[PDB]
Amino acid sequence: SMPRVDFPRSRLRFKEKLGEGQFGEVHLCEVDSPQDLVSLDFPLNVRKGHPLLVAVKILRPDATKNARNDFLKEVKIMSRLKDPNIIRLLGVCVQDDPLCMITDYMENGDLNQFLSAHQLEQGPTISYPMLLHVAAQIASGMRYLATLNFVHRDLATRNCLVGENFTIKIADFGMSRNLYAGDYYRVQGRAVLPIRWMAWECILMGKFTTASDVWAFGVTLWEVLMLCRAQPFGQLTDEQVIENAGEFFRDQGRQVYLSRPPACPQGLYELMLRCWSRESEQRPPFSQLHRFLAEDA
Numbered sequence: 668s669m670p671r672v673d674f675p676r677s678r679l680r681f682k683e684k685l686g687e688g689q690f691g692e693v694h695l696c697e698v699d700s701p702q703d704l705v706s707l708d709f710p711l712n713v714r715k716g717h718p719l720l721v722a723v724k725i726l727r728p729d730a731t732k733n734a735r736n737d738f739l740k741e742v743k744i745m746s747r748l749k750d751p752n753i754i755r756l757l758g759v760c761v762q763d764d765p766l767c768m769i770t771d772y773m774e775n776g777d778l779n780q781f782l783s784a785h786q787l788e789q790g791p792t793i794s795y796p797m798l799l800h801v802a803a804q805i806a807s808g809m810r811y812l813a814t815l816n817f818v819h820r821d822l823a824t825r826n827c828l829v830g831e832n833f834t835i836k837i838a839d840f841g842m843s844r845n846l847y848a849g850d851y852y853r854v855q856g857r858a859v860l861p862i863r864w865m866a867w868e869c870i871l872m873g874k875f876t877t878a879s880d881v882w883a884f885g886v887t888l889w890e891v892l893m894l895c896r897a898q899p900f901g902q903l904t905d906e907q908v909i910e911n912a913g914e915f916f917r918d919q920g921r922q923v924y925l926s927r928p929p930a931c932p933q934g935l936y937e938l939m940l941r942c943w944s945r946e947s948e949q950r951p952p953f954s955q956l957h958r959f960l961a962e963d964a
């Protein structure tokens with residue numbers, strides 16, 4: 668943790684359960700007069716007498732030593748991350764049970780669900796420059812993580828949350844949602860990996876770097892431009908995805924690239940292809956990616 672004191676528990680008014688997991692639950696709560704509890708570098712846009720909505724992740728009160736240790740590890744990592752496009756840890760309750768971590772609340776859910784409910788410009792719609800701005804926010808969030816020497820290792824639209832006015836917050840749900848079980852591949856009956864988003868060198872040698880995050884961003888950019896209508900490499904089985912990673916390693920031109928999304932102009936698709944360069948050093952840094960997406964595209 669980075670908060671010096673526990674967030675006062677009595678200031679969280681329960682509104683609604685947001686989900687239940689093996690280790691606990693997530694509650695939507697209200698906080699009255701939050702100015703004295705909320706860090707000054709975080710925006711408060713509440714009318715007089717209106718409360719701030721926050722998300723509270725609560726660890727089961729009978730959790731194991733291990734699950735409790737995992738929970739506190741997640742708290743410490745989140746306490747470091749202060750950026751307009753990264754989920755924010757607003758407070759914690761860790762001096763007594765049950766353990767709690769309080770995040771800002773992104774009322775529109777994860778980005779994959781959000782884009783699925785939009786059509787390209789009926790129901791709710793979204794246009795090409797708005798999709799560029801979504802991806803630019805992700806790139807901006809990732810550029811910040813890179814400056815911390817922090818490797819996300821699971822960037823994908825399912826791990827981005829959407830607030831008001833299309834604001835994007837990068838997050839990490841872990842691998843704890845049945846909805847996305849198909850996006851992970853179990854290796855030798857133990858760990859689970861997001862192979863369709865991983866660079867060939869993550870698949871084959873287990874090396875995770877900002878450079879492989881750049882690769883993942885390219886797949887995530889492809890998702891955004893597809894409006895999340897299709898799993899990346901959907902035509903390939905998991906074993907074919909792993910074989911495709913062999914083809915990248917051999918670089919004989921038999922490797923398979925994701926196709927240009929219909930809404931994607933050629934110059935932008937060419938930028939995506941550079942995120943999948945075989946050499947880590949030839950992938951563009953996030954600073955270059957954000958510049959292109961916020962301006963040149």
Ligand SMILES: Cc1cn(-c2cc(NC(=O)c3ccc4c(c3)C[C@H](Nc3cncnc3)C4)cc(C(F)(F)F)c2)cn1
Nearest residue numbers: 693722724740741744754770771772773837838839840
């Ligand atoms: C060991 C470890 C931990 N992390 C890590 C952990 C995180 N954790 C989260 O993103 C997180 C935490 C708590 C809650 C949620 C998400 C959903 C829910 N709030 C919610 C709000 N609004 C709408 N729905 C739901 C409660 C994030 C990251 C980040 F930022 F780097 F990506 C990294 C990496 N390694």
